[PDB]
Amino acid sequence: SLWVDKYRPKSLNALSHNEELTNFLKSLSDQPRDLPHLLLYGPNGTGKKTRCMALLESIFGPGVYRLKIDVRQFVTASNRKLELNVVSSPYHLEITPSDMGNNDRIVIQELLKEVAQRYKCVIINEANSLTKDAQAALRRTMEKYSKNIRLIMVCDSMSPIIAPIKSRCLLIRCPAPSDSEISTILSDVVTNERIQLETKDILKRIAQASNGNLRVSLLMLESMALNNELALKSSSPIIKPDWIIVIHKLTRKIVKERSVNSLIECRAVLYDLLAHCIPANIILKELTFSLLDVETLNTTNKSSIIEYSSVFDERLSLGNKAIFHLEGFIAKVMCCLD
Amino acid sequence: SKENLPWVEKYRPETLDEVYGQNEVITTVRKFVDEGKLPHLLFYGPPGTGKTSTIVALAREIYGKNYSNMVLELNASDDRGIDVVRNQIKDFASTRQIFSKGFKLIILDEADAMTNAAQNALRRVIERYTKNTRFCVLANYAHKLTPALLSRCTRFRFQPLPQEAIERRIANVLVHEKLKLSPNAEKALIELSNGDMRRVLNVLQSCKATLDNPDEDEISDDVIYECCGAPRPSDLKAVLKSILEDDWGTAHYTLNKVRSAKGLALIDLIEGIVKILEDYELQNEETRVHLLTKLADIEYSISKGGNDQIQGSAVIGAIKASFENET
Amino acid sequence: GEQWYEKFKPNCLEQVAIHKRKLKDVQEALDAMFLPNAKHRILLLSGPSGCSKSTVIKELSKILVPKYRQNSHKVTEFRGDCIVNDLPQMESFSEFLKGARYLVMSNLSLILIEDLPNVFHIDTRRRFQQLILQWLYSSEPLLPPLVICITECEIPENDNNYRKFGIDYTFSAETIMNKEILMHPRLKRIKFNPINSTLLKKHLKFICVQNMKMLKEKNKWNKRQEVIDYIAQETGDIRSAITTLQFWATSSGSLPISTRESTISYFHAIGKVIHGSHSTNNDNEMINNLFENSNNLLSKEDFKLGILENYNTFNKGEFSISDASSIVDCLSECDNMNGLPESNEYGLREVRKTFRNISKQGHNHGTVYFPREWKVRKLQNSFKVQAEDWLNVSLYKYNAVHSFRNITLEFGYYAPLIRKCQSYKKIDVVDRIGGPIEA
Amino acid sequence: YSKLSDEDVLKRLLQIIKLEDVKYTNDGLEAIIFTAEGDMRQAINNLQSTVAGHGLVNADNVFKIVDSPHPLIVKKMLLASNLEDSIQILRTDLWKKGYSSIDIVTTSFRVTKNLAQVKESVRLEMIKEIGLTHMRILEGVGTYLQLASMLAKIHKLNNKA
Amino acid sequence: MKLKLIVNGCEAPDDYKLLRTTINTVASLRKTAILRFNSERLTIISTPKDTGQLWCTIPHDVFRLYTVISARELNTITMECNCDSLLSVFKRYDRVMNQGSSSNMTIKLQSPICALGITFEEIVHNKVIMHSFKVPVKLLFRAQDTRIQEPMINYIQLMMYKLPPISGEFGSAFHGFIRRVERYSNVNHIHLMGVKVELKIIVNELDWHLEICWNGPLDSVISTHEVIIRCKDWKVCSKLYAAFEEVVLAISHDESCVFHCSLDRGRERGQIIYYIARSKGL
DNA sequence: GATTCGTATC
DNA sequence: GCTACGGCTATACGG
DNA sequence: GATACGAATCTTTTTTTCCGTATAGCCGTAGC
Numbered sequence A: 001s002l003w004v005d006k007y008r009p010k011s012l013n014a015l016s017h018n019e020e021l022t023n024f025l026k027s028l029s030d031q032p033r034d035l036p037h038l039l040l041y042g043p044n045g046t047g048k049k050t051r052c053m054a055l056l057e058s059i060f061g062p063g064v065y066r067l068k069i070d071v072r073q074f075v076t077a078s079n080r081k082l083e084l085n086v087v088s089s090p091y092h093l094e095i096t097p098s099d100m101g102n103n104d105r106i107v108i109q110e111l112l113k114e115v116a117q118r119y120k121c122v123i124i125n126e127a128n129s130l131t132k133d134a135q136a137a138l139r140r141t142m143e144k145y146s147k148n149i150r151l152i153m154v155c156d157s158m159s160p161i162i163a164p165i166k167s168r169c170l171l172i173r174c175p176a177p178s179d180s181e182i183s184t185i186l187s188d189v190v191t192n193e194r195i196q197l198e199t200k201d202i203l204k205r206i207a208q209a210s211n212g213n214l215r216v217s218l219l220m221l222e223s224m225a226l227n228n229e230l231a232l233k234s235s236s237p238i239i240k241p242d243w244i245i246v247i248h249k250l251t252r253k254i255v256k257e258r259s260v261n262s263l264i265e266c267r268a269v270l271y272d273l274l275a276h277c278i279p280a281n282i283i284l285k286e287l288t289f290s291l292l293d294v295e296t297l298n299t300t301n302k303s304s305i306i307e308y309s310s311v312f313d314e315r316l317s318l319g320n321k322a323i324f325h326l327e328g329f330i331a332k333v334m335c336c337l338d
Numbered sequence B: 001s002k003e004n005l006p007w008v009e010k011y012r013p014e015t016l017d018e019v020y021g022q023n024e025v026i027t028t029v030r031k032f033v034d035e036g037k038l039p040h041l042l043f044y045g046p047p048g049t050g051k052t053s054t055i056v057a058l059a060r061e062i063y064g065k066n067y068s069n070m071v072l073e074l075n076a077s078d079d080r081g082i083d084v085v086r087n088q089i090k091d092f093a094s095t096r097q098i099f100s101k102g103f104k105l106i107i108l109d110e111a112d113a114m115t116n117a118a119q120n121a122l123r124r125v126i127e128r129y130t131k132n133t134r135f136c137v138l139a140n141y142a143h144k145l146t147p148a149l150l151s152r153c154t155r156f157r158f159q160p161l162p163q164e165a166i167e168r169r170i171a172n173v174l175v176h177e178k179l180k181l182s183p184n185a186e187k188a189l190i191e192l193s194n195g196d197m198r199r200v201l202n203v204l205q206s207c208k209a210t211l212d213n214p215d216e217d218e219i220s221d222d223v224i225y226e227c228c229g230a231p232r233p234s235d236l237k238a239v240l241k242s243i244l245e246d247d248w249g250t251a252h253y254t255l256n257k258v259r260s261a262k263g264l265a266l267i268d269l270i271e272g273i274v275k276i277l278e279d280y281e282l283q284n285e286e287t288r289v290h291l292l293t294k295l296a297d298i299e300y301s302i303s304k305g306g307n308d309q310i311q312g313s314a315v316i317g318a319i320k321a322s323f324e325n326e327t
Numbered sequence C: 001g002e003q004w005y006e007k008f009k010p011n012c013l014e015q016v017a018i019h020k021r022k023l024k025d026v027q028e029a030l031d032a033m034f035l036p037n038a039k040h041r042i043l044l045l046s047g048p049s050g051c052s053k054s055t056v057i058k059e060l061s062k063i064l065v066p067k068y069r070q071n072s073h074k075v076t077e078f079r080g081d082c083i084v085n086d087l088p089q090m091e092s093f094s095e096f097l098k099g100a101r102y103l104v105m106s107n108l109s110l111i112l113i114e115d116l117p118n119v120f121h122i123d124t125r126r127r128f129q130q131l132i133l134q135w136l137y138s139s140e141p142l143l144p145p146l147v148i149c150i151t152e153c154e155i156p157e158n159d160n161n162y163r164k165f166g167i168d169y170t171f172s173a174e175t176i177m178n179k180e181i182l183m184h185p186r187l188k189r190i191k192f193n194p195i196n197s198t199l200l201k202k203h204l205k206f207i208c209v210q211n212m213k214m215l216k217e218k219n220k221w222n223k224r225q226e227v228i229d230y231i232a233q234e235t236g237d238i239r240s241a242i243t244t245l246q247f248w249a250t251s252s253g254s255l256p257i258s259t260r261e262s263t264i265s266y267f268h269a270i271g272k273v274i275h276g277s278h279s280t281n282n283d284n285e286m287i288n289n290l291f292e293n294s295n296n297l298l299s300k301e302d303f304k305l306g307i308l309e310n311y312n313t314f315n316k317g318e319f320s321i322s323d324a325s326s327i328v329d330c331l332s333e334c335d336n337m338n339g340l341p342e343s344n345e346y347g348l349r350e351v352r353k354t355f356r357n358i359s360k361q362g363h364n365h366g367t368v369y370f371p372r373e374w375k376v377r378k379l380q381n382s383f384k385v386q387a388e389d390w391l392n393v394s395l396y397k398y399n400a401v402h403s404f405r406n407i408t409l410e411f412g413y414y415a416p417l418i419r420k421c422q423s424y425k426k427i428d429v430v431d432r433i434g435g436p437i438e439a
Numbered sequence D: 001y002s003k004l005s006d007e008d009v010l011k012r013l014l015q016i017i018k019l020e021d022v023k024y025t026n027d028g029l030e031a032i033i034f035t036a037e038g039d040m041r042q043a044i045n046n047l048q049s050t051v052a053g054h055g056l057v058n059a060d061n062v063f064k065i066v067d068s069p070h071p072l073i074v075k076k077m078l079l080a081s082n083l084e085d086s087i088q089i090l091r092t093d094l095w096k097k098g099y100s101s102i103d104i105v106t107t108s109f110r111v112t113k114n115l116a117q118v119k120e121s122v123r124l125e126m127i128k129e130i131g132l133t134h135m136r137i138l139e140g141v142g143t144y145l146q147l148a149s150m151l152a153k154i155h156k157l158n159n160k161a
Numbered sequence E: 001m002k003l004k005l006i007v008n009g010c011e012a013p014d015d016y017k018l019l020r021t022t023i024n025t026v027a028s029l030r031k032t033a034i035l036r037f038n039s040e041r042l043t044i045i046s047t048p049k050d051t052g053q054l055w056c057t058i059p060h061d062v063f064r065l066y067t068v069i070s071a072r073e074l075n076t077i078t079m080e081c082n083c084d085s086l087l088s089v090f091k092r093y094d095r096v097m098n099q100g101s102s103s104n105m106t107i108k109l110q111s112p113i114c115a116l117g118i119t120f121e122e123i124v125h126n127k128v129i130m131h132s133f134k135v136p137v138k139l140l141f142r143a144q145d146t147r148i149q150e151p152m153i154n155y156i157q158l159m160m161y162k163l164p165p166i167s168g169e170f171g172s173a174f175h176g177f178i179r180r181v182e183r184y185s186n187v188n189h190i191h192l193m194g195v196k197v198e199l200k201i202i203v204n205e206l207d208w209h210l211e212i213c214w215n216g217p218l219d220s221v222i223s224t225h226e227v228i229i230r231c232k233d234w235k236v237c238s239k240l241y242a243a244f245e246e247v248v249l250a251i252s253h254d255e256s257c258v259f260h261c262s263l264d265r266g267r268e269r270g271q272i273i274y275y276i277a278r279s280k281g282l
Numbered sequence F: 001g002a003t004t005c006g007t008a009t010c
Numbered sequence G: 001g002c003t004a005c006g007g008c009t010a011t012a013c014g015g
Numbered sequence H: 001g002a003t004a005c006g007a008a009t010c011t012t013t014t015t016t017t018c019c020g021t022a023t024a025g026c027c028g029t030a031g032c
């Protein structure tokens, strides 16, 4: 399929971008009997999930990647059907709170109660999406059923994880690779499939345009390769996500025009972005950082922007409707820049 | 088997004369009983003030032996929805008295947890069958009750327990359990009670447990502070002196040493400093605002949790910045 | 001995308090519905209470039914309180409809559903929906005309729970009928308005002169004019106006004249919060009465979204950015109070104060609109379906677990681009998920 | 039906005294009317309790059996000039008397909703502060410190900065 | 797409009773049922897709005439019909012989949504009264038929219990043992017990316990076997046990329970299988 | 409550 | 005289 | 002919209790 899973390191020894983390994983996998619950935190796209899969292969042998996708039904306190997908595999379970909202407590409760009845490893992607109640059940579920189950959850920015869960887990950090290592991985990819590659500098450009993201860099490489007729050019344009371009245009409009009509246009742009199912926290983050790369703003304007960004992202974290906080942040930026 | 019970449910008053503190309410309800007329009572006050004990003793005094069938007690533990009020309460307050004459007593313990529809149905039962039935309503929050229900109920306010009632109850407990209490420990116990008898009884039981040999051993203020884990007044005064007079490094060192000497909690120190600073005389009125606001958000953040050392440094900085306004 | 609104009921079409245009386009619809091949199957009338909805249908049936009836006069009104022995309650309306379907030729009679069955119970409400859906979709060659009158009233709060539905908040045609019934080719809807001051004054004057002796005996004849004007100004309900006039006339003292208070509409409340209300220059009193009388509408997240959407229409967006920033900051602060009444009070008070401070004469405001959040939710649902399809095809043709977060961030745009060149240069999903992002 | 006036309540009360023949004082009847706050049933209940508990109905006995309405105490607390007087009133009239903090917050919200002789901006700022305090009380922090901070912020917004 | 069949209850009693029992079971289980008309057997399926599935096999020799023709493989005509209409038709036809008759029941597939023309005769006493019925059905697609399959059962820990025939001396006692748990109103889970022969019905709850045990002779056709199932499925098992002489019970440890009923027509034997999932875990 | 278009009346 | 089955009724469920 | 008045438009997807239906259990009568 895509080049992201085409060159995904299946084994522990095939991971060659952290070194120290690989040695620590080998240390953990030396004696799996005393393996505690693991929590992996780091930048998105670093490869924490790849490390988890490699560790599971190092423990249970090859075969962890034999995923079967199943359909499960759950009932809340009231009569309701919850069609939750389960991607289980030998000695491995996958749960993600992306599809399920506030009902995320009962699904994980039933799943962990059924699986917990050697041990079976359970992987929870995006551990930050829990609503502080599934965490309340999970802490006791893993504290009492530690003999027949092990929990390995990956996440980024583990601040919304409650203190008891973080106390009940081993904290493992997965730093993003340097630009040279991403360039080396891209060089290996283009050695496996020749892409002409006129200059080595474009690989560094792709690495720098991803901010330490392997998945984004590989997607960029594949996009340029397919668009440039199975070739590459030194002057080939850098391809970026559409919502990044939309946010940059929104930043340009905010800097240029500061008025109520411009505020309504910004609200329409934010509504389009929300309708495209982009989370509002990262929308605020990208908008704030795109405002800070504007070279026509002084230091006082940047400080005001970052202060309003902190206030409004805290408000959005403690809020219900995301449009209010985004509109407030944009209006505060407009009232500060004028 | 009263020796096999917690001290809170061991010294529950059985007669009206055994209830201390609320002398006015006790005298008023006793006059009501002796005159033979009892209105629809409503008891309001903080927890542990003695409302349930008072109403239970009153019902026992009115019906000495017929308490089982002359008294219907419902609380939050039982369902008190619209159907229960419509059926069970009406059936109880619709039949004649068995042989005791007088009236039927219905006690609604913790009526603030009842739904609004239940109170709306209950008001007509109260004002309809009042010839042979009287209602008593106990609640800690009056905002959760319908204004009509408050209108048809005679309100009695249960004040927090004064000093003398606490002294008398503690003396009775000491006589019963053959225990000794220092006057300093007595003063410490009343201060931490906060007008609550249950807290006093629990702390006294924990202090008796703390002693290696209960008899021939007095309970001092050190025993109280060790059992309940509260800071001593001297520790609070030293911490406040270090924060107010000394520089930042030594104030932080003093706070850390005081907290690590006995494992004290930062919230208890915050409450102690708040209580001490209330007695202070501030001539700026901005120091008061800064202190109250900063300590309120710090206490709230502690309630939500977080970094403890950061919160302590925040307390020190807030106090210093607030007292910088007094110049 | 009889009520005035009952003893002075209209006897013909000319005595019905209704606008000429309303009479015309109800007459045309009813006449078209009596044709052998009528495009419209049923007639839906919506409006506030006492808007001559029921009576005008009666006076029209007095002149239309006797004309179209075959040779071999009134309506066949559904009566919900009839309890038949061998009839379950949900089957009563079905039996009524089946019996009334036999009213086509030589038995023609208009069907007037003024009081609907119990729609506050969900089972019979769905039964009503699927029963009137079958009437519109019936294969019957000809059916009797059906007229449904629904009174648009706000249901007051009864029980405390956040599972409140549309029927629980307000009693309107939108909450009762679903989208299929309302948007049907064989359904004609004629919304009604409250009776204007002119017809109310004319009919009150007619009622007064019909009892001239009784007002002249009580010396109230000279004071009847101001009473008529004030009653017509206060309310638009003909029944309430006639009842109040009868109460005033039969009185013998100086009791003040009082009428029922109509609820304030959603856009009416939005305009009151934004532009203020005339005859009330005190913002505190207006806000207090709005919260006391229309707490159901105010205590909703839809109202705050409406304020956020429509606050830019005060002067077509021609006001200082500081005021807009203050309004949106206050709304964001209110969003963090977990729906407390203090949040709504503070938000409305701040919006009203901000718009009052900058208010000037000669302002040309804009048109307010409903919030577009439901459209955003529908687009998000479509994006969710497309992302589920992408994750299913990516987990069926091969083994690759990607998170929905990564689908929205990168795989929603990069993967369609990969599938595009891969396909044209030569998987299933080729377009950007959720459509392209514009502006 | 409007709220009952003081004169009508006094007339009905005096009729009840004349029917029951109990001793009364004009100051006591005024106190009963003041505590009733236009509620006739409350006036009758308070009068009956006073007669059955103390006999002669004066201001002393009435104010010793029944309490002054807490909305008026809260209104006096909110309208205080300096923070020290408001803090003292709050403490000695709601905290030492045994009034729950949530009751104080709700009463403050109602009083601010029905508070005259104040500006709209000041009123909405105090409403926002009372709402924040209400949220803090509901979430669990129901100490006297929160009420003191609410009063401090109210006074800060009253006297500006 | 030409389906036609004729049923004579009086000519062959046992298979008609089997068909009536299958119809009663699928009606009691849930509304609507799946009728798979294979060219050599008819399979009646009740698929709720935890709740159980009933898979009854009816050979073509059961009916007097079994012309089944369709463009699909092996002339597979699959249809979904409401059990209540079919149950009412079967009750009418049963009362037809109960009042005294021997007329045959002719069923034809007369027209995706179709209907069966189930028509039969009745004679009161020498009068002719034609009973005509039309039950609306839907025609399941070929792929949709492929989506329905009989769940296979593992034999790693599954153990068979040969329940006594109801015609024997111990049959009535065993029927009483099976229905002994049905007389409790507040029962929702039955926790079975087999150790290696005894069958124990255990209903353990917060403040009451139940220990129904079978002390009579039992056979296991040729270790603990526990599975907890809902009470409603046990009612269906009891109903199936009464109508079948050859009843086989299979219990899987914390996996499932299988209620196998067989009718020895010898000839292909008619069989009824009721797969029951555990309501919850041990 | 605001805007916009159409009538009836003074 | 006994059993089966249909009709009436009390109770749990659902939305 | 100017103006007050009126119509059309500006819109939507936990907990308690209650209303009507489903269902199982038990009693009364026809038939074997």
Ligand SMILES: Nc1ncnc2c1ncn2[C@@H]1O[C@H](COP(=O)(O)OP(=O)(O)OP(O)(O)=S)[C@@H](O)[C@H]1O
Pocket: B007, B008, B009, B010, B011, B012, B013, B018, B019, B020, B021, B022, B045, B046, B047, B048, B049, B050, B051, B052, B053, B054, B139, B140, B165, B169, B197, B198
């Ligand atoms: N005035 C008092 N005199 C003696 N013991 C008291 C007194 N008040 C409280 N107590 C003790 O405290 C215990 C608990 O008090 P209760 O009266 O049962 O509860 P409460 O005062 O009604 O508080 P709430 O609002 O119901 S939580 C009693 O059983 C007594 O042992």
Ligand SMILES: Nc1ncnc2c1ncn2[C@@H]1O[C@H](COP(=O)(O)OP(=O)(O)OP(O)(O)=S)[C@@H](O)[C@H]1O
Pocket: C004, C005, C006, C008, C009, C010, C015, C016, C017, C048, C049, C050, C051, C052, C053, C054, C055, C056, C114, C149, C151, C203, C238, C239, C242
């Ligand atoms: N001139 C008049 N024009 C109209 N109605 C009149 C008149 N004089 C008396 N009435 C009475 O006023 C009442 C108005 O009722 P309608 O508006 O026809 O009923 P409705 O529209 O269904 O209102 P609801 O929703 O049922 S309260 C009727 O009882 C009429 O008889």
Ligand SMILES: Nc1ncnc2c1ncn2[C@@H]1O[C@H](COP(=O)(O)OP(=O)(O)O)[C@@H](O)[C@H]1O
Pocket: A003, A004, A005, A006, A007, A008, A009, A014, A015, A016, A017, A018, A043, A044, A045, A046, A047, A048, A049, A050, A051, A154, A185, A214, A215
């Ligand atoms: N050591 C490595 N060498 C090569 N590619 C890697 C390595 N680690 C991660 N990747 C690439 O990263 C991609 C996805 O990373 P992922 O595990 O999703 O990151 P995260 O766990 O942070 O979401 C994989 O397709 C894989 O090819």
Ligand SMILES: [Mg+2]
Pocket: B051, B052, B109, B138
């Ligand atoms: Mg109590």
Ligand SMILES: [Mg+2]
Pocket: C053, C054, C055, C114
């Ligand atoms: Mg009407």
